[PDB]
Design a binder for these strands. Structure first.
Length: 51
DNA sequence: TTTTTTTTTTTTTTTTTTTTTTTTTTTTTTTTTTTTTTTTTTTTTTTTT
């Protein structure tokens, strides 16, 4: 449920760190499930409890 | 008057989602064949003339 602009904001906040968004056989960003968790953990979306 | 770097055009390739067609398997289906109960036909004996 993250709009494209929100997801680009999240990856602009995240990617400059040491993390690399692992790509599959192609360049397509193959964000692992844990990668997605971390991304939206620090993306700024409050959890169902922390909100 | 010249050079360097970055933000825009466009171009190329891949994955996921959603397009169609065919075959195999499953369901409803009358014809033919098979099974059972039966009304008509055949045989013998006893009694009477």
């Amino acid at each position: 449920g993250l709009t494209r602009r929100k997801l680009d904001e999240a990856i602009a906040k995240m990617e400059e760190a040491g993390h690399q968004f692992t790509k599959n056989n192609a360049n397509h960003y193959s964000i692992s499930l844990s990668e997605a968790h971390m991304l939206m953990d620090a993306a700024g979306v409050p959890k169902f409890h922390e909100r």
